Design an enzyme around this catalytic site. Structure first.
Site, mmCIF file in Angstrom:
data_model
loop_
_atom_site.group_PDB
_atom_site.id
_atom_site.type_symbol
_atom_site.label_atom_id
_atom_site.label_comp_id
_atom_site.label_asym_id
_atom_site.label_seq_id
_atom_site.Cartn_x
_atom_site.Cartn_y
_atom_site.Cartn_z
ATOM 1 N N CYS A 180 0.815 -1.208 0.000
ATOM 2 C CA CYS A 180 0.000 0.000 0.000
ATOM 3 C C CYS A 180 0.852 1.263 0.000
ATOM 4 O O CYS A 180 0.399 2.315 -0.465
ATOM 5 C CB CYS A 180 -0.933 -0.007 1.210
ATOM 6 S SG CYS A 180 -1.558 -1.648 1.653
ATOM 7 N N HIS A 319 -2.852 6.319 6.955
ATOM 8 C CA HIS A 319 -3.107 5.122 6.169
ATOM 9 C C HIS A 319 -4.585 4.763 6.212
ATOM 10 O O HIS A 319 -5.203 4.519 5.169
ATOM 11 C CB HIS A 319 -2.249 3.971 6.696
ATOM 12 C CG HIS A 319 -2.142 2.814 5.755
ATOM 13 N ND1 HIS A 319 -2.168 2.965 4.385
ATOM 14 C CD2 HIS A 319 -1.993 1.489 5.985
ATOM 15 C CE1 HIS A 319 -2.050 1.782 3.812
ATOM 16 N NE2 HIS A 319 -1.942 0.869 4.760
ATOM 17 N N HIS A 357 -9.141 2.216 -0.571
ATOM 18 C CA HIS A 357 -7.750 1.806 -0.412
ATOM 19 C C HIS A 357 -7.213 1.410 -1.778
ATOM 20 O O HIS A 357 -7.454 0.300 -2.258
ATOM 21 C CB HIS A 357 -7.639 0.657 0.579
ATOM 22 C CG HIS A 357 -6.233 0.218 0.830
ATOM 23 N ND1 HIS A 357 -5.507 0.635 1.924
ATOM 24 C CD2 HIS A 357 -5.411 -0.589 0.119
ATOM 25 C CE1 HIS A 357 -4.303 0.097 1.882
ATOM 26 N NE2 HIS A 357 -4.218 -0.650 0.795
ATOM 27 N N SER A 621 9.488 52.590 -50.901
ATOM 28 C CA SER A 621 9.107 53.757 -50.101
ATOM 29 C C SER A 621 9.178 53.359 -48.631
ATOM 30 O O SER A 621 10.273 52.997 -48.165
ATOM 31 C CB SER A 621 7.746 54.259 -50.588
ATOM 32 O OG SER A 621 7.328 55.396 -49.852
ATOM 33 N N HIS A 875 -22.612 -35.900 6.771
ATOM 34 C CA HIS A 875 -22.426 -37.189 6.105
ATOM 35 C C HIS A 875 -21.043 -37.724 6.458
ATOM 36 O O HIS A 875 -20.028 -37.387 5.845
ATOM 37 C CB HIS A 875 -22.605 -37.052 4.600
ATOM 38 C CG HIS A 875 -22.724 -38.362 3.888
ATOM 39 N ND1 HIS A 875 -21.631 -39.061 3.424
ATOM 40 C CD2 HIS A 875 -23.809 -39.104 3.566
ATOM 41 C CE1 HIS A 875 -22.037 -40.176 2.844
ATOM 42 N NE2 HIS A 875 -23.355 -40.226 2.916
ATOM 43 N N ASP A 1054 -29.963 -38.306 0.520
ATOM 44 C CA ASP A 1054 -29.237 -39.331 1.258
ATOM 45 C C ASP A 1054 -30.126 -39.992 2.302
ATOM 46 O O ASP A 1054 -29.995 -41.191 2.553
ATOM 47 C CB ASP A 1054 -27.998 -38.730 1.917
ATOM 48 C CG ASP A 1054 -26.940 -39.769 2.219
ATOM 49 O OD1 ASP A 1054 -26.246 -40.204 1.275
ATOM 50 O OD2 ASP A 1054 -26.803 -40.157 3.397
#
Lengths: 1111, 117, 117
Positions: A180, A319, A357, A621, A875, A1054
């Protein structure tokens, strides 16, 4: 003074920003920061469908809990590759970070008031902070389709190098990565590079972009990101940091270097220290002690006493990432650095609350927040701060996070506003910068240039809109910034206008016309107009609008009064005929001759004020007399005096204009005698006479009175003089008809082309027939610029001479940014990569569909771990958690659903045929990842017949060490439609002993079937005659990432399978002497409509019958 | 002795095959992948282990990166703010990404050797 | 190393007409991924239909047969005979230019592995 600090204070002179919330320029970024808004938004699908990667649990495999970010609202693939001389393939290969870095660096150079030509070839350095290089992964995830220029296009280093490559810079081109802090660290390095004197300028840039889920998944694996999607700095809601897309560029120079170069200053980086966190409690954990030491050392290096409030910083861009563990450390560091050594508080505010950020550029982002603030005396607020975090409260005594745009705290007189910027990168590289406000102790043509005529037209439109929006801005400063402080580019246009309305209308005319010029040439030939070409009311606007021209006219009047008393004074045309409103005709010799002479003298003096290097050819001239002054040998006073005294031709090979019944004839011959007799007592540049054909083209022979007599007596060989000037100086570039255009344009340009065969040298008039004097001269300068860039003339010197008061300010800050073409989207996406970033939701039990899937072939890839599937813990076989065979069946049925949806089909019925469970997936632990790849290939797509046959295979790999194996296989038969299907159940088999469900599952566990929670959902059962029946809970299962229910909760299916065992074995009998697992299902058949209806009904409890056909 | 001092670190890395090999399949990515493979950490982690407080840049100027780091380290040593400075560099061959990318520009030597001049 | 990543770095040669086997392939299911451009396949320039270079149907057939060979090798089987049944060419691959990349993904799933038979 502010330049007396121990280390020379670097200075931010300009900046270029691509920040979220439409902040495509520093002004917009400042407006956003001081007036924050909810910029953050869901990751646009144009970047990557984060919903395809979103999951509430951050640590979930291949998912991110932060589906929001402060994303740029611009198409990052839209890049002006033509502007930067980058080919389409290379531009596509480029990292959007690099492209936006180029754009932002050019914007910063422009705002600082610098021409790319001026910096071209210099020792300017570059230091780019990049951390989140999604490109080089998105563009390279599929090695196939990688473009040829991918290596340099996506290489992290090139991010800096390419910049210097485009701008022809030779200074260091580091691409920093300190997480950062990267960009801020770059600033420090740039600062160091600027304090060595080896680089007069240094770009400190940063780039963080959201192009792929890589960064999101990685950071969410550590829970670094904010699931709420916002970096709640120091707030009780601190749960991470929200990623933000930002590309910043900051032009840095030594304060003395900036001042000597006359660059407008944005702020003063007094000192920028960089330190690192020690062996903190984790690599990611920041250290408060390290940051406190960093702040103290930075202030000491700056010559600032941390204990003194005067040397303190009133604002502190922290920060402030919203990390619950990092924010308290930063607050403690700030408090212990600025306090804890013993009453306005020390304001602390992180830009990442507003723009997010932004990782690599985050530092620079904060710097910008500290810069603009300190320049505008406003402490920007923080968008997300509602309640101080309890962990931060102890260190919040002397600190205050601004929730409103707060005016800067009162300061001792003479002390600049001081702010501080902190950026900590994970790993612990902390960068701290101390910033301060810089204490600051007739018009040029409006020039525009672009690499493309389309861009130039957009520039004209934007400048017109800017003038409409900012009529208050001084036109002189605007044009001077556009000339001297703005880059010149191949396609050029120039607008002529004395005032804002005039310049706006001329811009409108240029926009409608679309006429522009394309592609060290200040060499001009001065062709001087003579009598008979003078127009009425010449210099009337110049005299009455330019004090410099007025002073020149006063000098001319003084010269006029210096005439011999017999001819002193020839009545002042400067105050009688050069008058606005009157515009009286001037054909009389006594006024026409000196009028033209004064016109040409003023024009040539103005041109020399612009530092235009001249070659001179005389006209007739007046055209001669003024030209004599242009030679650099005769004074302007003498020229105008001789013109007034005189008051009282072969233009080309095809043009001859000898005139009589007059000059060059006997008519004026007698009066020439006394005139010369008076001229005897009255009076550097390559200069060629034409009145005298060849002899008097020399410095010493042109001062004789006989030459001034020949001016009106001898015939004028103007063509011969032009030939001499252009043949002896073949390197001539342009010619200017000084005075009364267009008298000499056609014959002169024809002579130039004839002498230089086919060389159509540029021609320019500066005082047209009846046009505004300011507009005429500005159009001459406009032609010069459009022809030879800034090298044509110097605007700084011109404004040094013209209007010495109010020296022009570099308003390039307020000028519109370059209108980048953006027509073509340069991006790289293998269709597999596109299906990866994009695509369907990560369907539960299936994961993400393979990038290389088809409407006819599919492969859902997943890495199932029991803790990520809450119910899967239920299970268990022999203690180990085992993926249910019902799990494979539900996976196959959901794959069938997704396939039908891919074909826009609704499955009326869903059979699974000849299914086989080959290898049960054993989970070593709830956190163990077992790869499941369900490959489903529709062997028959007969929607015309209303059928779809799909061979499916759930391949499994228990651990990454092993190879991918087959967990299950079978076929799917879907009865479908473009959007009672099953036999009614048997008659609830009559007599069945009531199976004690608790005892049933107890025995099952005794035999290794350690079913639990959802898999004990068998509400009631009863068995007899090798049969069972009852009711099992049809518990619903829905994908939270999709928000829709599944066909079956594998627990319910099941349990249905367990019904077979129940029919086979009663509780407490032990007929189930070994653990049977479903190995081969001959035919499942599900009515998806009815299953979904039951799941959504809320009953979630359905009856069942079952035959133990073989026992 | 160096533990807790102001020693700096400047690491030149250009060819981060890890953060691609370990992250090509987003699934199976470990929890600490972010910091483990992040280019910057290459320097930071060093100072993290040795308890150093000096600058911990991870430079990337392509082939020059490490040498550039030295320069920065040299500068960091000439300021007096760091009594010591690690100038490090790391290039590793863990994935074909770099090979394919460079060979796309024909930068690499097909013979497999950098035949200087 | 995700096992997909391991199969990516490692794995079989990039078989011609097939490319690299997909990272998520199995002994029972395979997906060879390739990006065919005519200049990379020298002979492919010879099959032109209406001027455009078109991937031959024989090309698809050879791809299928090579996939069968690779599958048999995966099972350590030698193919005595190789039939292709009910084959259909649904969309001819048109190559805009010799440098144009057309992605070909041959997904082959052994619905029956009866080496016992």
């Amino acid at each position: 003074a502010q330049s007396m600090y121990p280390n020379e204070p670097i200075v931010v002179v300009g900046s270029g920003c691509r920040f979220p919330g439409d902040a495509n320029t520093p002004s917009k970024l400042w407006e956003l920061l001081q007036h924050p808004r909810d910029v953050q938004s869901r990751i646009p699908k144009e970047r990557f469908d984060v919903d395809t990667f979103y999951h509430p649990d951050g640590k979930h495999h291949g998912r991110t809990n932060a589906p929001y970010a402060y994303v740029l609202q611009d198409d990052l693939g839209a890049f002006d590759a033509a502007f930067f001389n980058i080919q389409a393939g290379e531009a596509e290969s480029m990292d959007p970070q690099h492209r936006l870095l180029l754009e932002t660096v050019y914007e910063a150079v422009t705002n600082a008031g610098m021409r790319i030509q001026d910096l071209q070839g210099t020792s300017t350095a570059v230091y780019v902070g990049v951390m989140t290089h999604d490109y080089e992964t998105v563009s390279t995830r599929d090695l196939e389709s990688i473009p040829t220029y991918s290596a340099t296009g996506v290489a992290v280093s090139v991010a800096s190098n390419r910049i210097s490559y485009f701008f022809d810079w030779h200074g260091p081109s580091m691409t920093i990565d300190t997480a950062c802090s990267s960009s801020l660290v770059a600033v420090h390095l740039a600062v160091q590079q600027l304090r060595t004197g080896q680089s007069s300028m240094a770009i400190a840039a940063g780039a963080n972009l959201i192009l792929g889920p890589m960064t999101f998944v990685l950071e969410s694996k550590l829970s670094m990101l904010s699931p709420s999607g916002r970096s709640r700095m120091w707030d009780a809601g601190a749960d991470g940091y929200a990623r933000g897309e930002a590309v910043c560029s900051v032009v840095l120079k030594t304060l003395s270097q900036a001042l000597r170069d006359g660059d407008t200053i944005e702020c003063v980086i007094r000192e920028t220290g960089v330190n690192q966190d020690g062996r903190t409690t984790g690599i990611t954990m920041p250290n408060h002690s390290a940051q406190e030491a960093l702040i103290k050392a930075t202030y000491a290096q700056a010559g600032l006493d941390i204990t003194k409030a005067e040397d303190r910083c009133q604002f502190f861009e922290a920060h402030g990432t919203g990390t619950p563990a990092g924010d308290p450390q930063e607050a403690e560091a700030i408090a212990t650095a600025f306090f804890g050594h013993e009453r306005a508080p020390l304001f602390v505010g992180s830009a990442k609350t507003v723009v997010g950020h932004t990782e690599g550029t985050a530092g620079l982002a904060g710097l910008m927040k500290a810069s603009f603030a300190v320049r505008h005396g406003v402490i920007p607020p923080n968008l997300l701060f509602d309640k101080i975090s309890p962990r931060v409260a102890p260190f919040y005594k002397n600190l205050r996070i601004p929730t409103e745009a707060t005016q800067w705290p009162a300061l001792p007189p003479g002390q600049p506003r001081r702010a501080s910027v902190n950026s900590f990168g994970f790993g612990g590289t902390n960068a701290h910068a101390i910033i301060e406000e810089y204490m600051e102790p007739l018009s040029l043509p409006l020039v525009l240039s672009a690499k493309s005529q389309r861009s130039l037209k957009i520039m004209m439109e934007e400048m017109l809109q800017f003038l409409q929006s900012h009529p208050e801005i001084h036109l002189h400063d605007l044009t001077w910034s556009l000339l001297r402080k703005r880059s010149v580019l191949p396609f050029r246009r120039a607008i002529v206008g004395h005032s804002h309305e005039t310049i706006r209308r001329a811009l409108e005319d240029a926009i409608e016309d679309g006429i522009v010029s394309s592609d060290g040439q200040p060499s001009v030939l001065g062709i001087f107009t003579g009598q008979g070409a003078q127009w009425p009311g010449m210099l009337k606007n110049l005299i009455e609008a330019s004090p410099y021209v007025r002073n020149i006219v006063r000098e001319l009047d003084d010269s006029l009064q210096s005439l011999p008393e017999k001819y002193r004074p020839s009545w002042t045309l400067l105050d009688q005929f050069m008058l606005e409103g009157e515009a009286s005709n001037v054909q009389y010799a006594t006024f026409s001759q000196p009028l033209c002479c004064a016109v040409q003298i003023v024009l040539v003096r103005l041109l020399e004020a612009a530092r235009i290097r001249f070659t001179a050819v005389v006209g007739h001239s007046s055209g001669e007399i003024a030209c004599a002054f242009a030679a650099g040998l005769i004074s302007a006073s003498l020229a105008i005096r001789i013109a007034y005294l005189r008051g009282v031709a072969s233009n080309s090979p095809d043009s001859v204009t000898f005139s009589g019944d007059a000059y060059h004839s006997h008519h004026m011959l007698p009066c020439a005698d006394p005139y010369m007799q008076a001229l005897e007592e009255c009076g550097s540049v390559p200069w060629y006479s034409s009145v005298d054909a060849e002899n008097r083209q020399m410095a010493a022979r042109d001062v004789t009175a006989k030459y001034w007599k020949d001016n009106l007596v001898s015939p004028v060989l103007f063509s011969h003089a032009v030939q001499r000037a252009v043949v002896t100086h073949k390197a001539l570039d342009i010619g200017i008809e000084v005075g009364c255009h267009p008298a000499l344009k056609s014959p002169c340009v024809a002579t130039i082309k004839d002498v230089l065969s086919g060389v159509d040298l540029a021609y320019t008039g500066c005082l047209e027939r009846g046009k505004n004097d300011l507009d005429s001269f500005s159009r001459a300068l406009a032609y010069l610029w459009e022809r030879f860039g800034a090298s044509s003339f110097d605007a700084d010197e011109f404004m040094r001479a013209v209007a010495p008061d109010r020296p022009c300010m570099s308003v390039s800050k307020l000028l519109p940014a370059y209108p980048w073409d953006r027509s073509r989207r340069y991006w790289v996406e293998s269709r597999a990569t596109r299906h990866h970033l994009r695509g369907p939701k990560p369907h539960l039990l299936l994961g993400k569909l393979s990038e290389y899937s088809t409407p006819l072939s599919f492969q859902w890839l997943n890495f199932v771990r029991p803790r990520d599937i809450e119910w899967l813990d239920g299970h268990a076989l022999q203690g180990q958690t085992v993926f249910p065979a019902a799990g494979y069946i539900v996976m196959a049925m959901e794959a069938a659903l997704m396939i039908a949806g891919t074909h826009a089909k609704q499955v009326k019925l869903l059979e699974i045929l000849d299914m086989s469970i080959d290898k049960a997936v054993i989970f070593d632990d709830e956190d163990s990842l077992v790869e499941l790849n369900l490959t489903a290939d529709v062997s028959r797509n007969a929607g015309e017949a209303g059928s779809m046959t799909i061979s499916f295979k759930i391949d499994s790999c228990l651990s990454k060490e092993g190879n991918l194996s087959l967990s299950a296989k079978g076929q799917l038969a879907l009865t479908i439609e473009d959007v009672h299907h099953l036999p009614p159940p048997e008659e609830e088999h009559p007599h069945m002993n009531r199976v004690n469900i608790n005892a049933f599952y107890h025995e099952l566990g005794l035999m290794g079937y350690n079913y639990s929670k959802d898999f004990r959902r068998l509400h009631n059962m009863q068995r007899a005659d090798l049969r069972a029946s009852g009711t099992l809970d049809f518990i619903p299962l829905m994908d939270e990432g999709n928000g829709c229910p599944l066909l079956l909760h594998p627990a319910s299916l099941d349990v249905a399978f367990q019904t077979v065992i129940g029919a086979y074995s009663s509780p407490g009998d032990r007929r189930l002497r070994c653990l049977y697992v479903p190995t081969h299902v001959d035919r499942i058949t599900l009515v998806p409509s009815l299953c979904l209806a039951t799941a959504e009904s809320g009953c979630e409890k359905v009856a069942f019958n079952t035959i133990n056909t073989y026992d």
